């Protein structure tokens, strides 16, 4: 229900124009984030353990597309530096 994570076809990721979306990159640290609007983000390289307040972990690897919804507050444990093409909406 919260935290949509799945492994989409790579074809639709072309059509979405993900190459034209903003890159983001970060260090091997951990911090806590707040999504306040919808954000679709495709993991192109690296490893993270997100965890929600329910203590559910959501690791995402190279191949996981994610959409966080409008209003969610979770941790981000960057277990290797990651690159995710994102777009807010």
């Amino acid at each position: 229900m919260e935290v949509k994570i799945e492994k989409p076809t790579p074809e639709k990721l072309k059509e979405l124009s993900v190459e034209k979306w903003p890159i983001w990159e970060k260090e091997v640290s951990e911090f806590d984030w707040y999504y306040d609007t919808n954000e679709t983000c495709y993991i192109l390289e690296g490893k993270v353990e997100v965890t929600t307040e329910d203590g559910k972990k959501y690791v995402i690897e190279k191949g996981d597309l994610v959409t966080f919804p409008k209003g969610l507050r979770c941790r981000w444990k960057v277990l290797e530096p990651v690159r995710k093409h994102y777009n807010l909406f």
Side-chain angles (χ1 to χ4, degrees):
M1 268 50 187
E2 295 72 40
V3 181
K4 212 58 158 281
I5 296 165
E6 48 177 38
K7 297 73 130 270
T9 173
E11 289 183 272
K12 187 144 163 166
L13 294 181
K14 308 306 302 186
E15 301 200 301
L16 268 29
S17 71
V18 186
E19 58 140 19
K20 311 207 194 296
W21 293 14
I23 284 183
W24 182 99
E25 25 163 282
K26 198 56 172 77
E27 214 173 36
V28 69
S29 206
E30 70 190 299
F31 52 76
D32 66 280
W33 197 264
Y34 192 120
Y35 299 126
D36 186 69
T37 12
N38 308 289
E39 186 176 353
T40 293
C41 29
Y42 180 56
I43 305 302
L44 298 107
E45 53 197 327
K47 231 305 294 280
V48 180
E49 261 185 294
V50 185
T51 210
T52 62
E53 198 54 49
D54 285 58
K56 304 268 184 188
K57 271 89 160 296
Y58 304 96
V59 44
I60 45 189
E61 324 76 17
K62 177 177 186 197
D64 276 18
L65 173 73
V66 193
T67 301
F68 295 99
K70 180 160 188 172
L72 187 68
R73 324 92 78 152
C74 51
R75 260 60 57 69
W76 277 48
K77 189 177 194 92
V78 201
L79 298 165
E80 272 292 86
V82 77
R83 236 175 177 136
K84 38 74 85 165
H85 274 110
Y86 72 99
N87 209 20
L88 310 172
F89 70 120

